[PDB]
Write a protein that binds this ligand. Structure first.
Ligand SMILES: NS(=O)(=O)c1cccc2c1c([N+](=O)[O-])cc1[nH]c(=O)c(=O)[nH]c12
Lengths: 96, 41, 49
């Protein structure tokens, strides 16, 4: 199975290549986290697809609705298999 | 690197990060994107 | 070389290929890496054919 990776467009971690209109799939993107994802996949033995989180957020729990947004939410609610991004380890995220 | 509670993927993902660190690959990637591709010398 | 590394009015460079260019690119010595980043970023080019 193809592993679904959630990430976020922020330089220099993940950036769309200048010529991305001529490219397909993962090769549309470049950056530190793109290179890291490739190294992790090679060491762990999986194929993967880079997807960009829809709401453009890292991950916080709404005070009113208690719903997690961002990349954290994509993992919590079962929509993605892994997040490879500039995502800070914090107490409230480690809890979920 | 984050994942889904209890996900089996998280135990090989973590070992890979520790290995890439010890091999100097994470330092190589930071240098590539910040300094080799930097514009200010 | 320390004199060169501390200034920019007098430009400086290497062959555009070969062992001399590679010495500067890979050095972990502070003075030599300072010289390398200058050469890499300079416009117009400080390298020669
Ligand atoms: N300043 S920001 O862009 O608006 C920004 C806002 C909110 C969270 C950020 C963040 C940035 N950042 O600086 O790029 C990096 C980062 N890295 C993490 O690991 C994390 O958990 N959260 C963040």
């Amino acid at each position: 199975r193809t592993v679904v990776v959630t990430t976020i467009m922020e330089s220099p971690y993940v950036m769309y290549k200048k010529n991305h209109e001529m490219f397909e799939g993962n090769d549309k993107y470049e950056g530190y986290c793109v290179d890291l994802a490739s190294e992790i996949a090679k060491h762990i033995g999986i194929k993967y697809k880079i997807a960009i989180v829809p709401d453009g957020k890292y991950g916080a729990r709404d005070a009113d609705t208690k719903i997690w947004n961002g990349m954290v939410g994509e993992l919590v609610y079962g929509k993605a298999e892994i997040a490879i991004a500039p995502l800070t380890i914090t107490l409230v995220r480690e809890e979920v | 690197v984050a994942t889904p509670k209890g996900s089996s993927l998280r135990t090989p993902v973590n070992l890979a990060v520790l290995k890439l660190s010890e091999a100097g690959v994470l330092d190589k990637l930071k240098n590539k994107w910040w300094y080799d591709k930097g514009e200010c010398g | 070389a320390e004199d060169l590394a501390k200034q920019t009015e007098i430009a400086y460079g290497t062959l555009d290929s070969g062992s001399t260019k590679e010495f500067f690119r890979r050095s972990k010595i502070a003075v030599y890496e300072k010289m390398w980043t200058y050469m890499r970023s300079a416009e117009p080019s400080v390298f020669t054919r």
